[PDB]
Amino acid sequence: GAPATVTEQGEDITSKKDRGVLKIVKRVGNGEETPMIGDKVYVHYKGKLSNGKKFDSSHDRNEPFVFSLGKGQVIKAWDIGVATMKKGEIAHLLIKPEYAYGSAGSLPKIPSNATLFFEIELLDFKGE
Numbered sequence: 150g151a152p153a154t155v156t157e158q159g160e161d162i163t164s165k166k167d168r169g170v171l172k173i174v175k176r177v178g179n180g181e182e183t184p185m186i187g188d189k190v191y192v193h194y195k196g197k198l199s200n201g202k203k204f205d206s207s208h209d210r211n212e213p214f215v216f217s218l219g220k221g222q223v224i225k226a227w228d229i230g231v232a233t234m235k236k237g238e239i240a241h242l243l244i245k246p247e248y249a250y251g252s253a254g255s256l257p258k259i260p261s262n263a264t265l266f267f268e269i270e271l272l273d274f275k276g277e
């Protein structure tokens with residue numbers, strides 16, 4: 150499935166090159182600009198435990214998910230991964246627990262040492 154393909158073909162986008170955040174561009178976006186720390190970002194996404202076992206979607210609320218990049222308002226993997234994306238891009242991320250919820254997890258929703266998968270569409274980003 151999509152997670153296993155990311156394992157297979159995904160680029161390591163971590164500074165430490167620890168495969169903690171793996172990325173595949175599924176649909177190439179447009180323009181050269183990728184967002185800066187502080188930018189307001191708008192995405193659609195689907196997320197799940199690599200298991201399959203909890204599934205979450207912005208499309209379940211039929212409205213974009215909005216956050217400020219690089220303030221830890223989202224897990225580390227999003228701050229890293231969304232920063233790499235161009236407007237219109239769809240990316241798959243596969244994320245080791247160190248870049249998500251860690252040994253602690255976020256119980257009961259997310260267990261200890263969970264790997265996460267996301268499909269993210271970067272809709273827009275604007276200056277703060």
Ligand SMILES: COc1cc2cc(OC)c1OCCn1cc(nn1)CCCOC(=O)[C@@H]1CCCCN1C(=O)[C@H]2C1CCCCC1
Pocket residue numbers: 194196197198203204205214222223224227255258259265
């Ligand atoms: C850990 O608590 C949640 C995680 C996720 C979804 C949750 O509810 C929809 C959720 O409940 C609390 C409410 N909340 C928080 C956030 N969004 N909603 C953004 C910040 C924390 O989330 C994140 O940083 C990441 C990236 C941005 C989208 C949400 N997300 C998640 O981790 C989802 C996970 C994804 C894996 C399957 C379960 C939900």
